[PDB]
């Protein structure tokens, strides 16, 4: 997926998917 988040996100999901 090219349209996914390209930025750094410290508040992204830190858990296991």
């Amino acid at each position, epitope marked *: 997926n090219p349209n996914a988040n*390209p930025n750094a*996100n410290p508040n992204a999901n830190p858990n296991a998917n």
Partner: antibody
Amino acid sequence: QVQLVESGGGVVQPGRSLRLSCAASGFTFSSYGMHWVRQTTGKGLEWVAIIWHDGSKKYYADSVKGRLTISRDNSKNTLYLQMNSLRVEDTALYYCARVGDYSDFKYGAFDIWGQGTMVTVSS
Amino acid sequence: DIQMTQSPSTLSASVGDRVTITCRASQSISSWLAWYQQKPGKAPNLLIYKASTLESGVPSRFSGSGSGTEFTLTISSLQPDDFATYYCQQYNSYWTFGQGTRVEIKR
């Protein structure tokens, strides 16, 4: 001041090379994905390539695959665009744009644009 | 390849007018749409993202609307610095721009 300053343009012959720079200042360059978007009066605004914030993912348009490679130096806050085997179809004004950090499922809004650098390929 | 078509291509307007710009989508793009403004010799500037959210620092006269395949950029009261060209860009699948809409001064 948040801004993007580009360099490396010029007129070259078909088949030669050219390296475009996009120096960033005023914000945290290491935490932003970057794009290259070229513009002509015939094709309009056309996306070229995208680089991830850490450089782990790269994606190119079909018309530039293999010939154009996008890179990034977070240590110097500069975005690069290596252009090889240049065709006359690559003649355009090239921009570098920052991906807006607006949380959603898709990301593609450009909130900061460079001033543009001109590439003219001709024999 | 998702194609962005803008209607109309050129429109006349005066200072204080309500202008409306249409952006068609070849396929559904939900609300993944951006609106830009470009003045001659200058890079484009983002006005609207996510179809209707207003970019910070942009005059509130600008407003976007629509979802799916039909979208709209609206300027409730056009000001002299609004005479430029406006592009719509989708970001549902890759990135594609419209052909642009020139806003000429009416006479």
